[PDB]
Design a protein around this ligand. Structure first.
Ligand SMILES: Nc1nc2c(ncn2[C@@H]2O[C@H](COP(=O)(O)OP(=O)(O)OP(=O)(O)O)[C@@H](O)[C@H]2O)c(=O)[nH]1
Ligand SMILES: Nc1nc2c(ncn2[C@@H]2O[C@H](COP(=O)(O)OP(=O)(O)OP(=O)(O)O)[C@@H](O)[C@H]2O)c(=O)[nH]1
Ligand SMILES: Nc1nc2c(ncn2[C@@H]2O[C@H](COP(=O)(O)OP(=O)(O)O)[C@@H](O)[C@H]2O)c(=O)[nH]1
Ligand SMILES: Nc1nc2c(ncn2[C@@H]2O[C@H](COP(=O)(O)OP(=O)(O)O)[C@@H](O)[C@H]2O)c(=O)[nH]1
Ligand SMILES: [Mg+2]
Ligand SMILES: [Mg+2]
Lengths: 54, 51, 427, 50, 430, 428, 440
């Protein structure tokens, strides 16, 4: 149990979501959601070009 | 208004502000309160004691 | 060993039960066809709490899915995890409830209550020592609020000594779907005080405030609000599924939270919620769980405890951590502010520590807190029951299913008594 | 520059090792006195003074 | 031939017995699979069989399976016999009533059968040790039921207690006071000696003496095991003054209602503050009477000692022991009661304490464990009474106890009995 | 474990705080991504006075950033060091105050305060032993002065044993930026009186007189004026971050310079400032700090102590220097200018020596000076209040948020006490 | 057998204790890391170090010291410096907030928290000692910890420990320069409350040692180490009769008996004569008469008061190195003949001498020379009655307007302790009068 009194754990600690795409971001770990919208801007511009040709 | 007169009278006709007592535990400087801890006798002084 | 039979009813109950069972199966390592593809051994040890066994190593859940229309559970049979639910557990009726408490309680759901009771009695006596049951429903609807309270009333006549829970979704004056949710909520919250051991409170206007002020989502859906409900639904039953330094089942939190048998309306909150852009500025440490879990901006009810007094407070930690730094932060909160804590209890807070964190995460915590601020939830609903009721607003819908106006009259003098029950400790 | 620094480290450190062995020999020579044992006669050889 | 039968009740009992039996298996030369890679000094704890194995004389009891199943599939799974680790089906749930009446009655008879089977093999059994926790439901109710059933079957046998008393400031639960009062009142006449520990006090000792910030229950269990080994050392290792198990009761319990002593282990220091400091007999004797090293967060300078027992381990000499004791007999800080003119019992053992790999404390040559009986433990029952009043004025939590078959008059009679106990502690010191 | 939770409010508050957090991070070796890339071992030993820690060796400040304009937060994130702040600590409203007091004290600033008081207790309770706070704001504007006197007023009532300072940018008469500023300046200085422990006065026309003449910059901007404000902001808190031969911190200075608790308006300065033409012509010796640090041109206020009396003097030195030459010049300026010191305090100068110089420099020194020559600052605000207030000038802008005209009346008699308290201690 | 427990309190006390305990490691053989390099007779060896160092089983010598502070940034340089392996970790006590130039914080509020932790550690050091002579204490009157807590430490040393001797070294505040404003109020309220609870008091001012270093040594622009290093040359010369062989031993009990006549007059004044630089020592012999006469020079005193305005009340002389006891006797008879130096009439004998053998130790980096002979002198003078007259002057000056008392009143102190602490000194300012007039 040296890790509980470790003075370098916060130095050698690594975040729960370091990047957007990583392996440990499943549904029980609640750092990843589906409603966060990425690819919203591209959906908006796709809809607007369809509106133009329409 | 005499501030030089009244600032003298503000401190004499009063009371000192007594602290909440504290004990420092370790050489690092860990400071606790004294009454809440189980050290000083406080609870045998109750009126419910021994009856 | 210690089984949990899951019951859920309504569109709100089924869309929560579709997301809770996805969380558990990722936590126990279950792929969407049934088998086990995990990596540890602790994932397969206590798996009979939720999953029954079948032939060929296939684990299917202990759920009963109830409704009154068929169109809700075709989107549950056709989702990602629609193939693991055993298809005889689905119970559906052909004509709905139509936002009516009466029609689901006396006419349409009186012919379907005895159809579900064959399913539960079949399978809750396949267990070896059933701990208790669980409901998840909506008080603002017609099926869960009218017939889900009918199943609660029937199974507490047959299995009395066990546990009942509800993750009830009481309505909201701000986020208001229907017009007639005052009548459905008031007639059901009188059915909750006599027949449930524990009962939480969930407002969709308080789940919105988490997805806008904490997780910063641009377009939250109902598929994100069900993620947060199911956060506080596995984190409560998490110490009889995994070992720990200090265990606590569902009954040990019932003993320590409710003083009097008519005072059991808690309100939840979950500790490591973090936005995407605020992700690398955080430290995953024990002080930073116990201090956002206690935040009034975090709670899963639309009532704030800065108006009332905390009767009791629970906390269920997960993850390998130190018992000294868990215990010093409960004394640190109880002593700074002795105006929000009741006096005839000297130590209000309970702690239990599991071992296995949520999958893909390091630490976690949950809050199950009993307050006298929960009475403003009822009187912001009972101020719109008697607003409608003095003019006999929508009453012809309800009287035609065989009730009387006395059933409407007793259900606010039972609701106001509980309001004045939680009131005498507020000062 | 890295390999030059490691060469100089090795050189000064061999000097330190020789001084350690000579220090232990002179401690053992500083032990002795009259009624101490483990002292004995030796022939006079020129290697002593060389 | 000098056997001790250990009984552990509760999750505290199981998680303490893990560290204790690890220490014993490493103190003698016993593998984690029963074999030994001769002398019979193990015979007070381990019994040999016909297959070369040495199986312990213990009984682990819990009302909940997920704390003994880790023993059943841990490192030491081949050592423990499968019928010495008894598990219920559903726990007592912080309830004295459940742990005493409704749930402990399905589990008391099998443990009595196992204790009969173990005690019909010890030719020279000294007595039982009970390790339990006041706060928990099993460790309060079932432990008190076991103390009520032991005395009618074994009588004048010695039974000793290690108790996790409720800590003064931090507690894990809300319903600790009802459990504590209702176990004290009903075990008060069926117990011979009850040593106290407090998890908060051992937290302070591990934080301040050792440098282990953020300690854990295993770091506490190692020190508890060191204390237990020092108490039972002289029945196994050779000594200059042996202290048998039948003497702590005789020299620490003046009155049959006052059997509540407190424990200290003297050189609990680390591997950098053992390099700077010599650890002689006078230093380790003078550091047991220090109120910053006690194992209950209470101060004996506000009270009067009534009996003391000092156990010495290692490279110790009787005149250094004698000079240390006669120094500590001259402080005006250490005040004894009027009617205790002698005071002390001294025991001396040769074998130095044994180091576990992975442990905290360093390797030493000398150690002291001291069990002192003080009047200054009255404020503990005063705070316990006050918090029982604070809950019980408004009749809080009472249905949780009454619904499982116990009347409401037991609260009133338990508070009256422990009020009489407070007057006893008041009046014996004057 | 002597922590400083740094508040800053307003556009003047935020873009001073963005520059103060550039000089601290270079002083402690923090690159703009947050991490630590220094070389020594004193740049990491006591860094928790200002910086918290996150995962991965990242350090985020203990700052809170407060404004009523949402368009001030994007200016904060446009600098080099805009990504080191945790994004929760920004507190932005939606509608500004816009040169007003009651708009910022009762109407809009009184409903923005209760979301900041969650954020300061968010951080003050997570310190091991908090020493006190700081504030940086301008009395001329509305966000910094209408609400920044209510931010002070709540936190003195909750935490009354700790320390509070203000680096107040009180308005100047010659650089008269806004017409309605004498009402904001007058009405807010009485809330500074009862609550604050120490308070400096940093006039903007005093900073212009340095950059025109001492540094000789052709085009000084506000980036070259926040440099001087923040060079004396970290010269006070420097010996509780780095070790010294004689120590002093924020509490010890308030003990020695404040003999009565209504007398806390100082006059900062900063010693080694040199133009580039006079750069190579200088000698880096000890009395070439004390000659400039005590020079009446060098002060950061727009008032002069040739008119009044130094009650006390502080001084903090930075650099490995000699205690005899540090101590003998303090005696040298006390004996010579013997008419500029009060009689009823006979050792008016307090001294500290800190070992570590600021990075890039060899020595340095910082001044804090308490005087009755700062009552001439308050009377010039009082002359342009009642020259303007007697004819009821802009009154309908203020009285329409539910002020009172008697509340205006009490706010010069609260100020005409300090201008006649400082007179009786000048007769002494 | 001849143990003495050093107590250091304050940043002034801690920084002095670094230079004192550097000297004691080279004066004996101990390394920075606590080992003698080798022992020529391991079973034998000399045990001279037991007055200061305590030896464990293996080889390690740990000092008999307690370093006290209320601010963390002073001791943490000791804790991670060269001598971080020499000191036992628990002897260096710190706080978390300093007492902040305040007698009230140092006595009543902040300093009354560490008092029951240092008293624990003092008993652990005072029970190793077979033959404890007395405690030494190093402090400064113008601090918070050096004035508040140190006045508190004497009071609970009187209760617990009885008559056991408690000698002081203090930094009395200099008359001209001073690094504080509330240095009067501390210096009055500490001198007043430690009259009955103190045994002796040797006083030195920083301004006076500045005069010697620029003039007698050649080092211009000194630093507090150059002042600290000279203080270690005084404490060693007091205690070197307890460790090294002597022709006249002087114990630590004989200073109070031979310099403190009356129960409110216990303030001698230190002086150390041959401090001359290593180029200016190349030219002049340093005989016993050349270094006896130099203690009596007011330009070589170690306090800023002149004894030519007052009467000597007693003297003490400690000699090191190569001195003949006959030539000691020749110089003292000479300094009696000069009528520039006057003794009080009721003290006809007025001396106490002590001759040692070990010459004082050269430390690398120090600015003195290697010298055979040395004198340290402690003399009690009536010309200290001019030092309280310039401290009455500066206490009442802030007390006319009652400046700064609001800091002290709300920190646990009633205001009536100001109008008794000075009015106590008024007796002491006229108590020094009645021993200053002849017996007609
Ligand atoms: N000091 C110490 N206390 C322990 C340890 N393990 C458990 N505890 C204590 O155990 C108490 C919790 O009660 P339980 O351990 O569950 O006792 P129990 O009899 O099993 O109670 P139930 O689970 O309801 O049956 C806490 O108050 C802890 O103080 C330990 O290793 N050391
Ligand atoms: N002679 C000498 N005096 C010193 C030395 N260091 C500090 N001083 C004196 O220290 C005094 C200032 O108080 P400090 O000792 O630094 O601080 P303190 O005693 O801890 O009191 P607080 O700062 O309030 O905690 C000044 O009067 C100096 O004379 C030193 O090394 N030698
Ligand atoms: N939080 C949450 N609320 C839901 C969900 N589905 C429906 N609701 C709410 O429940 C109410 C409608 O549910 P409803 O279909 O009438 O429930 P039913 O009558 O029992 O079938 C509305 O207030 C919705 O906002 C869900 O998945 N999550
Ligand atoms: N010294 C200095 N003065 C400033 C700064 N920013 C604004 N000011 C002055 O403050 C006044 C404008 O303040 P304003 O931003 O409107 O007030 P706020 O809204 O409270 O921040 C003008 O007189 C400016 O000269 C700055 O960064 N430094
Ligand atoms: Mg249990
Ligand atoms: Mg200090």
């Amino acid at each position: 149990e040296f890790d509980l009194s470790d003075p370098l754990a916060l130095k050698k600690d690594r975040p729960a979501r370091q990047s957007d795409y990583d392996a440990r971001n499943t549904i029980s770990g609640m750092q990843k959601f589906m409603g966060e919208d990425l690819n919203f801007h591209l959906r908006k511009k796709f809809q607007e070009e369809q509106n133009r040709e329409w | 208004k005499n501030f030089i007169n009244t600032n003298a009278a503000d401190v004499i006709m009063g009371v000192a502000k007594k602290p909440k007592p504290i004990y420092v535990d370790k050489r690092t400087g860990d400071k606790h309160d004294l009454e809440t801890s189980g050290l000083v006798p406080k609870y045998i002084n109750k009126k419910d004691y021994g009856v | 060993m210690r089984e949990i039979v899951h019951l859920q009813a309504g569109q709100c109950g089924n869309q929560i039960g579709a997301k809770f069972w996805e969380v558990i199966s990722d936590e126990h390592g279950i792929d969407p066809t049934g088998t086990y593809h995990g990596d540890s051994d602790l994932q397969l040890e206590r798996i009979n709490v939720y999953y029954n066994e079948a032939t060929g190593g296939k684990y299917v859940p202990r759920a009963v899915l109830v409704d009154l229309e068929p169109g809700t559970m075709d989107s549950v049979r056709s989702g990602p995890f629609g193939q693991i639910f055993r298809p005889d557990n689905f119970v559906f009726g052909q004509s709905g409830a139509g936002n009516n408490w009466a029609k689901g309680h006396y006419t349409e759901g009186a012919e379907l209550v005895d159809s579900v009771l064959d399913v539960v009695r079949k399978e809750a006596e396949s267990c070896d020592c059933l701990q208790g049951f669980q409901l998840t429903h909506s008080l603002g609807g017609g099926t869960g609020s009218g017939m889900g309270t009918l199943l609660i009333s029937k199974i507490r006549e047959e299995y009395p000594d066990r546990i009942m829970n509800t993750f009830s979704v009481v309505p909201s004056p701000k986020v208001s779907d229907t017009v007639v949710e005052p009548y459905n909520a008031t007639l059901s919250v009188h059915q909750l005080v006599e027949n449930t051991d524990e009962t939480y409170c969930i407002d969709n206007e308080a789940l919105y405030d988490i997805c806008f002020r904490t997780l910063k989502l641009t377009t939250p859906t109902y598929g994100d609000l069900n993620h947060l409900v199911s956060a506080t639904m596995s984190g409560v039953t998490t110490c009889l599924r995994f070992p720990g330094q200090l265990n606590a089942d569902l009954r040990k939190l019932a003993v320590n939270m409710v003083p009097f048998p008519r005072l059991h309306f808690f309100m939840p909150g979950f500790a490591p919620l973090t936005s995407r852009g605020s992700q690398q500025y955080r430290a995953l440490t024990v002080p930073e769980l116990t201090q956002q879990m206690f935040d009034a901006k975090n709670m899963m009810a639309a009532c704030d405890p800065r108006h009332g007094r905390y009767l009791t407070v629970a906390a269920v930690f997960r993850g390998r951590m130190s018992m000294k730094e868990v215990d010093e932060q409960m004394l640190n909160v109880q002593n700074k502010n002795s105006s929000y804590f009741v006096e005839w209890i000297p130590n209000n807070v309970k702690t239990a520590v599991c071992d296995i964190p949520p999958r893909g995460l390091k630490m976690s915590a949950t809050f199950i807190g009993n307050s006298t601020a929960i009475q403003e939830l009822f009187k912001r609903i009972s101020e719109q029951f008697t607003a409608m009721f003095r003019r006999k607003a929508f009453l012809h819908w309800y009287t035609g299913e065989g009730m009387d106006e006395m059933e409407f009259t007793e259900a606010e003098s039972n609701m106001n008594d509980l309001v004045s029950e939680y009131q005498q400790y507020q000062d | 520059q890295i390999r030059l620094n490691w060469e100089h480290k090795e050189t000064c450190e061999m000097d330190w090792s020789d001084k350690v062995e000579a220090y232990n020999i002179d401690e053992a020579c500083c032990r002795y006195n009259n009624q101490s044992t483990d002292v004995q006669f030796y022939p006079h050889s020129a290697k002593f003074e060389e | 031939m000098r056997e001790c039968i250990s009984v552990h009740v509760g999750q505290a009992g199981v998680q303490i017995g893990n560290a204790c039996w690890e220490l014993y298996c490493l103190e003698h030369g016993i593998q984690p699979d029963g074999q030994m890679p001769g002398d019979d000094s193990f015979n007070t704890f381990f019994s040999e069989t016909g297959a070369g194995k040495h199986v312990p004389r213990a009984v682990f009891v819990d009302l909940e399976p997920t704390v003994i199943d880790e023993v059943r599939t841990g490192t030491y799974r081949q050592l423990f016999h499968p019928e010495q680790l008894i598990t219920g089906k559903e726990d007592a749930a912080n309830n004295y009533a459940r742990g005493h009446y409704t749930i402990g009655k399905e589990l008391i008879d099998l443990v009595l059968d196992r204790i009969r089977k173990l005690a019909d093999q010890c030719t020279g059994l000294q007595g039982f040790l009970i390790f339990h926790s006041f706060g928990g439901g099993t460790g309060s109710g079932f432990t008190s039921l076991l103390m009520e059933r032991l005395s009618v079957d074994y009588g004048k046998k010695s039974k000793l207690e290690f108790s996790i008393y409720p800590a003064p400031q931090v507690s894990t639960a809300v319903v600790e006071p009802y459990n504590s009062i209702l176990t004290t009142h009903t075990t008060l006449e069926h117990s011979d000696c009850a040593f106290m520990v407090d998890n908060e006090a051992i937290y302070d000792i591990c934080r301040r003496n050792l440098d282990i910030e953020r300690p854990t229950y295993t770091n506490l269990n190692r020190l508890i095991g060191q204390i237990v080994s020092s108490i039972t050392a002289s029945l196994r290792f050779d000594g200059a003054l042996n202290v048998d198990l039948t003497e702590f009761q005789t020299n620490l319990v003046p009155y049959p209602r006052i059997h509540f002593p407190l424990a200290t282990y003297a050189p609990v220091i680390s591997a950098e503050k053992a390099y700077h400091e010599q650890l002689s007999v006078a230093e380790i004797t003078n550091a047991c009477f220090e109120p910053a090293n006690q194992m209950v967060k209470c101060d004996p300078r506000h009270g009067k000692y009534m009996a003391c027992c000092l156990l010495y381990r290692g490279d110790v000499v009787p005149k250094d022991v004698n000079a240390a004791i006669a120094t500590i007999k001259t402080k005006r800080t250490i005040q004894f009661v009027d009617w205790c003119p002698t005071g002390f019992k001294v025991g001396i053992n040769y074998q130095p304490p044994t180091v576990v790999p992975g442990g905290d404390l360093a390797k030493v040559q000398r150690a002291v464990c001291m069990l002192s009986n003080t009047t200054a433990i009255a404020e503990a029952w005063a705070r316990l009474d006050h918090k029982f009043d604070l809950m019980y004025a408004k009749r809080a939590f009472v249905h949780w106890y009454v619904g499982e078959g116990m009347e409401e008059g037991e609260f009133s009679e338990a508070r009256e009995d422990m009020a009489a106990l407070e007057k006893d502690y008041e009046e014996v010191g004057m």
